[PDB]
Design an enzyme around this catalytic site. Sequence first.
Site, PDB file in Angstrom:
ATOM      1  N   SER A   1       0.898  -0.994  -0.064  1.00 17.53           N
ATOM      2  CA  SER A   1       0.003  -0.021   0.110  1.00 17.53           C
ATOM      3  C   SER A   1       0.915   1.302  -0.065  1.00 17.53           C
ATOM      4  CB  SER A   1      -0.830  -0.072   1.279  1.00 17.53           C
ATOM      5  OG  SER A   1      -1.297  -1.244   1.472  1.00 17.53           O
TER       6      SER A   1
ATOM      7  N   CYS B   1      -7.300  -0.810   7.348  1.00 16.44           N
ATOM      8  CA  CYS B   1      -6.209  -1.337   6.533  1.00 16.44           C
ATOM      9  C   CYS B   1      -5.339  -2.363   7.523  1.00 16.44           C
ATOM     10  CB  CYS B   1      -5.404  -0.355   5.848  1.00 16.44           C
ATOM     11  SG  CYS B   1      -3.725  -0.782   4.947  1.00 16.44           S
TER      12      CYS B   1
ATOM     13  N   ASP C   1      -8.795  -2.029   2.854  1.00 16.37           N
ATOM     14  CA  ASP C   1      -7.508  -2.622   2.130  1.00 16.37           C
ATOM     15  C   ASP C   1      -6.808  -3.528   3.094  1.00 16.37           C
ATOM     16  OD1 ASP C   1      -4.274  -0.829   1.385  1.00 16.37           O
ATOM     17  OD2 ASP C   1      -5.089  -2.829   0.643  1.00 16.37           O
TER      18      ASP C   1
ATOM     19  N   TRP D   1      -5.184  -7.290   3.836  1.00 17.18           N
ATOM     20  CA  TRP D   1      -4.448  -8.518   2.971  1.00 17.18           C
ATOM     21  C   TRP D   1      -3.943  -9.417   4.202  1.00 17.18           C
ATOM     22  CZ3 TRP D   1      -2.354  -3.660   3.694  1.00 17.18           C
ATOM     23  CH2 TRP D   1      -1.208  -3.725   4.880  1.00 17.18           C
TER      24      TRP D   1
HETATM   25  C1  LIG Z   1      -3.558  -5.486  -1.693  1.00 16.32           C
HETATM   26  C2  LIG Z   1      -2.189  -5.673  -0.737  1.00 16.32           C
HETATM   27  C3  LIG Z   1      -1.493  -4.752  -0.069  1.00 16.32           C
HETATM   28  C4  LIG Z   1      -0.611  -5.064   0.596  1.00 16.32           C
HETATM   29  N1  LIG Z   1       0.199  -4.250   1.531  1.00 16.32           N
HETATM   30  C5  LIG Z   1       1.257  -4.368   2.077  1.00 16.32           C
HETATM   31  C6  LIG Z   1       1.826  -3.275   3.060  1.00 16.32           C
HETATM   32  O1  LIG Z   1       1.460  -2.028   2.958  1.00 16.32           O
HETATM   33  N2  LIG Z   1       2.688  -3.559   3.830  1.00 16.32           N
HETATM   34  C7  LIG Z   1       3.292  -4.818   4.047  1.00 16.32           C
HETATM   35  O2  LIG Z   1       4.317  -5.234   4.683  1.00 16.32           O
HETATM   36  N3  LIG Z   1       2.661  -5.957   3.225  1.00 16.32           N
HETATM   37  C8  LIG Z   1       1.545  -5.464   2.396  1.00 16.32           C
HETATM   38  N4  LIG Z   1       1.159  -6.796   1.674  1.00 16.32           N
HETATM   39  C9  LIG Z   1       1.732  -7.988   2.091  1.00 16.32           C
HETATM   40  C10 LIG Z   1       2.774  -7.929   0.993  1.00 16.32           C
HETATM   41  O3  LIG Z   1       2.327  -7.922  -0.336  1.00 16.32           O
HETATM   42  C11 LIG Z   1       3.556  -9.324   1.088  1.00 16.32           C
HETATM   43  O4  LIG Z   1       2.701 -10.650   1.326  1.00 16.32           O
HETATM   44  C12 LIG Z   1       4.467  -9.293   2.193  1.00 16.32           C
HETATM   45  O5  LIG Z   1       5.360  -8.250   2.123  1.00 16.32           O
HETATM   46  C13 LIG Z   1       5.266 -10.551   2.232  1.00 16.32           C
HETATM   47  O6  LIG Z   1       6.085 -11.022   1.001  1.00 16.32           O
HETATM   48  P1  LIG Z   1       7.288 -11.713   1.072  1.00 16.32           P
HETATM   49  O7  LIG Z   1       7.615 -11.894  -0.427  1.00 16.32           O
HETATM   50  O8  LIG Z   1       8.443 -11.354   1.817  1.00 16.32           O
HETATM   51  O9  LIG Z   1       6.696 -13.184   1.516  1.00 16.32           O
HETATM   52  P2  LIG Z   1       6.680 -14.212   0.890  1.00 16.32           P
HETATM   53  O10 LIG Z   1       7.790 -15.023   0.435  1.00 16.32           O
HETATM   54  O11 LIG Z   1       5.710 -14.132  -0.360  1.00 16.32           O
HETATM   55  O12 LIG Z   1       5.907 -15.323   1.924  1.00 16.32           O
HETATM   56  C14 LIG Z   1       4.675 -15.074   2.546  1.00 16.32           C
HETATM   57  C15 LIG Z   1       3.870 -16.208   3.382  1.00 16.32           C
HETATM   58  O13 LIG Z   1       4.852 -16.642   4.222  1.00 16.32           O
HETATM   59  C16 LIG Z   1       3.965 -17.374   5.199  1.00 16.32           C
HETATM   60  N5  LIG Z   1       4.573 -16.791   6.688  1.00 16.32           N
HETATM   61  C17 LIG Z   1       4.751 -15.281   7.213  1.00 16.32           C
HETATM   62  N6  LIG Z   1       5.285 -15.651   8.421  1.00 16.32           N
HETATM   63  C18 LIG Z   1       5.230 -16.684   9.037  1.00 16.32           C
HETATM   64  C19 LIG Z   1       5.380 -17.528   9.973  1.00 16.32           C
HETATM   65  N7  LIG Z   1       5.578 -16.890  11.216  1.00 16.32           N
HETATM   66  N8  LIG Z   1       5.104 -18.826   9.955  1.00 16.32           N
HETATM   67  C20 LIG Z   1       4.694 -19.763   8.903  1.00 16.32           C
HETATM   68  N9  LIG Z   1       4.427 -18.972   7.698  1.00 16.32           N
HETATM   69  C21 LIG Z   1       4.625 -17.466   7.707  1.00 16.32           C
HETATM   70  C22 LIG Z   1       2.602 -16.966   5.037  1.00 16.32           C
HETATM   71  O14 LIG Z   1       1.840 -18.249   4.464  1.00 16.32           O
HETATM   72  C23 LIG Z   1       2.699 -16.019   3.646  1.00 16.32           C
HETATM   73  O15 LIG Z   1       1.500 -16.211   3.002  1.00 16.32           O
HETATM   74  C24 LIG Z   1       0.001  -6.591   0.769  1.00 16.32           C
HETATM   75  C25 LIG Z   1      -0.811  -7.521   0.082  1.00 16.32           C
HETATM   76  C26 LIG Z   1      -1.829  -7.003  -0.600  1.00 16.32           C
HETATM   77  C27 LIG Z   1      -2.488  -8.290  -1.535  1.00 16.32           C
END
Ligand SMILES: Cc1cc2nc3c(=O)[nH]c(=O)nc-3n(C[C@H](O)[C@H](O)[C@H](O)COP(=O)(O)OP(=O)(O)OC[C@H]3O[C@@H](n4cnc5c(N)ncnc54)[C@H](O)[C@@H]3O)c2cc1C
Length: 604
Positions: free
Chosen positions: A391, A556, A601, A603
């Site tokens: 966001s 949010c 908003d 997620w």
């Molecule tokens: C419309 C929208 C807006 C968003 N806005 C924001 C924002 O403003 N800020 C923000 O930080 N994020 C936001 N997100 C979340 C963001 O897009 C990512 O999912 C997040 O940053 C994590 O991504 P990553 O690639 O590092 O994690 P990934 O590699 O994609 O891994 C995430 C997955 O790891 C798992 N996970 C996380 N912690 C643990 C745990 N302790 N134990 C077991 N499994 C775990 C979950 O199953 C999760 O689905 C938003 C998502 C959407 C859909």
Amino acid sequence: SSFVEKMKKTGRNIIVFYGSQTGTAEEFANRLSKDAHRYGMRGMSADPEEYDLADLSSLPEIDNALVVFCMATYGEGDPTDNAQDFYDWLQETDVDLSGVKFAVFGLGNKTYEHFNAMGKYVDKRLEQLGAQRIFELGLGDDDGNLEEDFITWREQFWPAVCEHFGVEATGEESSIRQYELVVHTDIDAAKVYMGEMGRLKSYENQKPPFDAKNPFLAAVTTNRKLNQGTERHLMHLELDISDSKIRYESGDHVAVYPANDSALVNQLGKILGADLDVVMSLNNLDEESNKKHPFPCPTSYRTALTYYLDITNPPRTNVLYELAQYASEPSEQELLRKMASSSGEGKELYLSWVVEARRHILAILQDCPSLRPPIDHLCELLPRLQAHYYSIASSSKVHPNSVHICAVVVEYETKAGRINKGVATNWLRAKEPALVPMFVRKSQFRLPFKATTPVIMVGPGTGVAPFIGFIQERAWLRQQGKEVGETLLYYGCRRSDEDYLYREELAQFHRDGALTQLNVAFSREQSHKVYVQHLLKQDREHLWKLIEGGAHIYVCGDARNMARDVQNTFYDIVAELGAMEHAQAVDYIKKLMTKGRYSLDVWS
Ligand SMILES: Cc1cc2nc3c(=O)[nH]c(=O)nc-3n(C[C@H](O)[C@H](O)[C@H](O)COP(=O)(O)OP(=O)(O)OC[C@H]3O[C@@H](n4cnc5c(N)ncnc54)[C@H](O)[C@@H]3O)c2cc1C
Ligand SMILES: Cc1cc2nc3c(=O)[nH]c(=O)nc-3n(C[C@H](O)[C@H](O)[C@H](O)COP(=O)(O)O)c2cc1C
Ligand SMILES: [Ca+2]
């Protein structure tokens, strides 16, 4: 190109359309299409956008015609972008679809307002039009386990098709490669993909418009740690979009194409004894399909595993199956194979050993060492690396040439005893103040049209992100002499001395009068827990007054529990002070959402 005509010429009778944004509905639709062969049929998967669905009425021309829709639901129960044309068609049309046979599997998430609204609408609409439902609507729930919801559904779909068209299990079940490998020994560099999406060199020679297929490489001008502790890492990033022509408004989302951990990619090559720097191309054995390659080709394996493939999430069942054949050791293969069964111990083993334990592809090859598959087959099985959404935390009125991100780095330990890292967050975290490929996605989350309308912002944790931009715009509006209504923020974190995001910025905003009120709830500062909804309840009198007056509510953050509790609290508020019943208050609130005065908003 009529999709019906193409089916006729390629001999297919089963067509599965996918409504997909992050590619899950695609694999599902693709997996159904490949299943046809086991039942004496010929099916194909397709993107509805590339065709005219009004041709559905010409389906009777194909013998034993069957159309299957794998549809995902997005923002406020709407269709994915590639299915907007189709949706628009379904509402204005009144064509008679007698003779069409269909089945619909929706991809949804129970923690959202309109659960699987797209799948439900398509299925309901086809019947009204006359088509004949050949199997019950499927309701996948990404909050539980979507995968399981799918294989469960599929297992009952085929038999049901078999019984209607009078066909049977050919018994046959031999894993069929979808792509064919070709090594490029004599290849110039100007012809090899190095991670860009779509067009070759698009990253180096940057030319607008920039969107999902042509990401703008923004410079990271600021990347600072927002929290004090070292247990977690919350960060604030500022991306330079000058010269990009990109526009946005507070409330919009910024998406980024990350890159996997370079060491994890190296570990993979070492456990497959494959030279990652070998340039190659994977070509679709179906010469008449559009997906000539699973991802930009030609390209090295390193580039493929680092930029185009998802090698971090738990692999889906169908992927664990194909890999079983590369498991020489008797007991390791046993393990993998069953992991695909619908229910039984297989469902449980999959959920526990793979999902719950969060085992990615490397982790599996490590816990099944006998398993030695060829790198090119793996590259076809794995899912694509998706763009990641955040966001926007800035107001374009204040920072037209910069997009801000507020995020928490995902890093934790698994049951398997490994350290799992989040792709985009760890990748963003290592960006020194140098490029990030991004693009803006328009949302419906917006400040009131009238600056004098009050706004109630509820954003615990990183949920505070869009509100930082909202606050800037509201302060900027007071400066331009405009009259601004009350602006309240309901923030929350664990300890004022650890994860209090933008503490000085908010405090300053409030001192200046821009932020009318700043209410923070510290969940771990005392005996019990204090959340934003508790503070919301205490302020019931004032919030009701603002609400009855036309205020806009925004929520949010965490969609799982937070969004629903905050909403339950707004129910109580309207019910207690609005002189009405709970059910009338639920109505009240839900009406606000349709008027655009209660925006979400969220997620997970
Ligand atoms: C419309 C929208 C807006 C968003 N806005 C924001 C924002 O403003 N800020 C923000 O930080 N994020 C936001 N997100 C979340 C963001 O897009 C990512 O999912 C997040 O940053 C994590 O991504 P990553 O690639 O590092 O994690 P990934 O590699 O994609 O891994 C995430 C997955 O790891 C798992 N996970 C996380 N912690 C643990 C745990 N302790 N134990 C077991 N499994 C775990 C979950 O199953 C999760 O689905 C938003 C998502 C959407 C859909
Ligand atoms: C911005 C966003 C909005 C969503 N909105 C809804 C929704 O209204 N209803 C629902 O049931 N699921 C919703 N979901 C969950 C998706 O429908 C689910 O994750 C699905 O697996 C996505 O499929 P795809 O990868 O094919 O696009 C949403 C997900 C995101 C990221
Ligand atoms: Ca207060």
